[PDB]
Paper text:
The main protease (Mpro) of the betacoronavirus SARS-CoV-2 is an attractive target for the development of treatments for COVID-19. In line with our original goal of identifying broad-spectrum inhibitors that target the main protease of coronaviruses and the 3C protease of enteroviruses, we also assessed the inhibitory potency of MG-78 against the Mpro of the alphacoronavirus HCoV NL63 and the 3Cpros of enterovirus A71 (EV-A71) and Coxsackievirus B3 (CVB3). Finally, coronavirus Mpros feature a catalytic dyad comprising a Cys…His pair, whereas enterovirus 3Cpros have a catalytic triad consisting of Cys…His…Glu(Asp).
Because of its higher potency, we selected the boceprevir scaffold, and replaced its P1-cyclobutyl moiety with the γ-lactam residue that was found to be an optimal residue for the corresponding S1 pocket of Mpro in previous studies, to yield MG-78. The resolution of the structures is 1.8 and 2.5 Å, respectively, for the MG-78 and the MG-131 complex. MG-78 and MG-131 make ideal hydrogen bonds to the anchoring points in the S1 pocket, His163, Glu166, and Phe140. In more detail, there is a strong hydrogen bond between the lactam oxygen and His163 Nε2, and a three-center (bifurcated) H-bond between the lactam nitrogen and the Glu166 side-chain carboxylate on the one hand and the main-chain oxygen of Phe140 on the other. Whereas the crystal structure of MG-78 in complex with the SARS-CoV-2 Mpro revealed an ideal fit, those of the complexes with CVB3 3Cpro and EV-A71 3Cpro demonstrated some steric incompatibilities that likely reduce the inhibitory potency.
Numbering used by the authors:
A (entry chain AAA), B (entry chain AAA): 1 to 301
The structure:
């Protein structure tokens, strides 16, 4: 049946993206009800961003400084406030294409679909994990700020990410829709380091079930281990500790394949000590850690 | 700025997906104007599919055998015809969410976004290449038939794939919207083999430019080669021959990075003869061949 990195359909989110412009600076906004959310550095010049004072910059702006465009339709801004690092523009018209939506803050390890946008126009959609060090390995050009990360539960859009900035080596940082950064980052153009990144162990295990579901069985061994013995080896290879909550959450996949989680931990223990000896798993020469159990159940059922 | 496998936003296509049911058998349809396109084996029982006679099966059906559902709204079928392996249901209502659309037949090597659907409901979106042997490495469960492949040019949806069936090892086959199979395949449940798959050389080269754009330079060498010398080595590793049309098409990327195509061919020649000596390129331990030049320009500009 096959296994691909797969994103949520982007339609409901597409109908929310607008272009916010303040002077020269123009980026993307999320239009929900009568509010446009965007990163607050839309009110900066290239120089302000080297060491901004957003409060100072925003007092100086009036409602009229803000050009919001939804297609060929302008939008009268009739208010503005700043929630942490996001800007909130009250507008005369409520968005008729506003879906049921929630704002959530995701945990490191959870995945989400990025709708990458330029000039308030949907360009493309891909899947990302929130890394342990609170970065994402996205793909963002200049103009992509405002682009959002989301998940869908049935009809409800769970917005969890808005893109702000890029760190050394094409890794990325942003906020929830409360305007709170993920990780210890600030919307200021000064040297900031990420913190070492770990491998999301529960996610690798989820992917090995995907592999088995799909007929890749070669790594399966006749052993189990204890959580304790497994975590002593994993710690050495910079894998996250596997908790009992991780085991419980892997339950469905264990049930779908009839392979106990501690048997699959036996397989992973061996792959870390020996590598793959020139062997692939779902076509990858590396262990893949950006598929959650919830992603695997979804796509393999 | 980063480099991810990225799909077109799926909104315009989302508004076209319906559920077609004939007896027990129910799959997805594409609703465009007053026509619903779906795979023709919707009129089969599990047993008919072992050796169908579609003409015989379809004569027996009347317009009323066909249940088309668009949300909670049924749709009066008022006609039916069969174009090769696709079924065309004329319906009383033209789809108001019908985008500008084209039907195109893609070449092996070209990429497209799959909108994977179950019960006429968009489930997820991913990117695929048409392989040299006219298969795709998709992810499709039972119920996914009718799901479509597309590209977007500005406002125009270029529909090129409709999913029919799965071959040995989670590879997939389908038709254009004329109902013509890609590859030598038939919509019948009997043993069929794929034909050996080659590596899309021009696509690997496109991806190496992506790598260089993104700061992965380690494989860059001080050599050029001739097309001829390169194709003599590539032929041995089951890489497609690189044509002058391939070189011409790589032009923009060569221009964006100031690396001649025959210099990058010098790099690739070395990677095939030596492998990567435990080195990654954009995080991959393998050479990636499912990004077209047109995909790389897009995402790296
Ligand atoms: C901005 O949001 C936009 N309108 O697109 C933009 C996003 C993209 C620029 C290129 N890649 C992107 O992700 N964000 C910025 O330009 C932010 C903005 C100003 C600097 N900045 C950056 O992303 C810089 N990174 C940076 O300073 N990194 C450190 C690790 C902090 C040194 C830049 C050098 C431009 C990529 C703020 C307000 C942070
Ligand atoms: C069908 O379109 C649907 N309603 O979902 C379905 C698609 C998915 C089944 C599982 N994976 C899919 O991609 N297609 C079929 O069931 C088609 C259908 C009947 C058999 N068939 C298959 O895909 C089979 N493959 C097959 O027979 N492969 C050979 C190489 C030809 C032996 C099956 C064994 C069910 C996966 C036709 C009309 C071909
Ligand atoms: Cl993928
Ligand atoms: Cl990817
Ligand atoms: Na103000
Ligand atoms: Na105000
Ligand atoms: Na008939
Ligand atoms: Na008829």
């Amino acid at each position: 049946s096959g296994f691909r990195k797969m994103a949520f359909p982007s339609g409901k989110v597409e109908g929310c993206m607008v272009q916010v412009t303040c002077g020269t600076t123009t980026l993307n906004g999320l239009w929900l009800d009568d509010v446009v959310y965007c990163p607050r550095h839309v009110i900066c010049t290239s120089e302000d961003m080297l060491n901004p004072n957003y409060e100072d910059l925003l007092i100086r702006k009036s409602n009229h400084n803000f050009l919001v465009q939804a297609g060929n339709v302008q939008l009268r801004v009739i208010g503005h406030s700043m929630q942490n690092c996001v800007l909130k523009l009250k507008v005369d018209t409520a968005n008729p294409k506003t879906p049921k939506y929630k704002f959530v803050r995701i945990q490191p390890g959870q995945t989400f679909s990025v709708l990458a946008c330029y000039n308030g126009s949907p360009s493309g959609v891909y899947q990302c994990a929130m890394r342990p060090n609170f970065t994402i390995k996205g793909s963002f050009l200049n103009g992509s700020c405002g682009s959002v990360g989301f998940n869908i539960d049935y009809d409800c859009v769970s917005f969890c990410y808005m893109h702000h900035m890029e760190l050394p080596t094409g890794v990325h940082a942003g906020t929830d829709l409360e305007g709170n950064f993920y990780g210890p980052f600030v919307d200021r153009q000064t040297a900031q380091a990420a913190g070492t990144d770990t491998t999301i162990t529960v996610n690798v295990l989820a992917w090995l079930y995907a592999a088995v579901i799909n007929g890749d069985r070669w790594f399966l061994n006749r052993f189990t281990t204890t959580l304790n013995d497994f975590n002593l080896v994993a710690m050495k290879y910079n894998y996250e500790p596997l908790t009992q909550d991780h085991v419980d959450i892997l339950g469905p996949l264990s049930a779908q394949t009839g392979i106990a989680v501690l048997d699959m931990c036996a397989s992973l223990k061996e792959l870390l000590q020996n590598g793959m000896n020139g062997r692939t798993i779902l076509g990858s020469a590396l262990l893949e850690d950006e598929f959650t159990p919830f992603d695997v159940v979804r796509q393999c059922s």
